[PDB]
Design a binder for this molecule. Structure first.
Ligand SMILES: N[C@@H](CCC(=O)N[C@@H](CS)C(=O)NCC(=O)O)C(=O)O
Ligand SMILES: N[C@@H](CCC(=O)N[C@@H](CS)C(=O)NCC(=O)O)C(=O)O
Lengths: 218, 218
């Protein structure tokens, strides 16, 4: 009976998080591709402050910010396995590592393709170091969520679709430095929800090339 | 029966958030002042990744990141009014605006005292604009949480203790531009939990002066 619309833009790893969370919890929804150059009345109505995607509109009410949206989904749709742990301590740990993806993985990945020379080299090193910290957190578990896809998996795994772009522009190989991280991503990709939610790495790379041309930083 | 320790550093608005949340929910705890130049074994044990305060140690388990800690406190101690709304939509809105404090209020406030000239002027303008957006969200309610101190109040109000420093270094007057925000802060300060948790603005300013001397940016 519920009305669910996702305002999104295809190459966004932030949008991919929400696509994955909706799929993982079996939520039926309408996907709406936004033109971010000419933002729709709906996007402006629903996210007046940030004017960004993704935005989830559920029964006429908007939820903004990808990680906030994933938590909302977890709290609202309950007829599947939880994405966040029920134990408060474990839940706080999951929040810590999901945030870490925003603060380190996204930020440093962005520096890899937007910067050059020594600054870019530093970003690559810090990016790899950050993935290594996540490998440590994963430990011997198959997923960050344990035996199923959890909040941290949803936060992180969409960035795999950007790895080829980071590697090609930055000139490095993540599998060589972080084989456990890559094994983990490939394991996640065996799942239909993950493979359907994540975009093609070649297409994402071509999108980043378009941005580099736009900003004159090839 | 529970063991609670807060690792903190007195002028930190992030630590003040946790001090306030613990007070608001009536949690007994031991406050531990950290020297961030010579970090203690305990801090290094409890926050190996970020090595930052605040850290809440509850029954031997660490919780890091101020907003994550406040949510943890809300989920664990239940014999007082909730800090976050029970309705998922309202809860997502509260998370949005608490995050906004980190992303705009803290960030822009920092630029006001660390930058000069035109860059500093831009930071002041954006800071005021951000407070105005929060005034709009407050609307006609006495607190962001409605009729009691909520998550967003805890996220925001500690920054009032830094306002005098921003105003003095940046040369502007927040009350003149944002009378509603200042009325709100003063209203919060009528509460014992808020007044006891927030530090003296003169002392905070003197701390910032120490930092400006340290970095040679007076
Ligand atoms: N912190 C946000 C980031 C969202 C974001 O960066 N969205 C971009 C697209 S990937 C956007 O809509 N940008 C607006 C613009 O470029 O005008 C989240 O997690 O949802
Ligand atoms: N995002 C963190 C920020 C905490 C933070 O910035 N902490 C500072 C003190 S205010 C710290 O411990 N700094 C470590 C250092 O300077 O080495 C939070 O919200 O808790």
């Amino acid at each position: 009976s519920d009305q669910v619309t996702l305002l999104d833009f295809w190459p966004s790893p932030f949008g991919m998080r929400v696509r994955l969370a909706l799929a993982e919890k079996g939520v039926k929804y309408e996907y709406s591709e936004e033109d971010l150059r000419n933002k729709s009345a709906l996007l402006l109505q629903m996210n007046p402050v940030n004017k960004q995607i993704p935005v989830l509109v559920h029964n006429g009410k908007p939820v903004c910010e990808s990680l906030i949206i994933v938590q909302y989904i977890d709290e609202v749709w309950k007829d599947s396995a939880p994405l966040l742990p029920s134990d408060p301590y474990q839940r706080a740990q999951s929040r810590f590592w999901a945030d870490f993806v925003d603060k380190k993985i996204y930020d440093l990945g962005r520096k890899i393709w937007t910067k050059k020379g020594e600054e870019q080299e530093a970003a690559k090193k810090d990016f790899i170091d950050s993935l290594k910290l996540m490998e440590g957190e994963l430990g011997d578990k198959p997923y960050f969520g344990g035996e199923t896809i959890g909040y941290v998996d949803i936060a992180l795994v969409p960035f795999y679709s950007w790895f080829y772009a980071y590697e090609t522009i930055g000139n490095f190989n993540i599998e060589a430095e972080c084989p456990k991280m890559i094994a983990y991503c490939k394991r996640c990709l065996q799942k239909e929800t993950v493979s359907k939610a994540l975009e093609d790495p070649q297409k994402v790379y071509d999108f980043v090339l378009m941005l580099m041309k736009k900003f004159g930083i090839e």
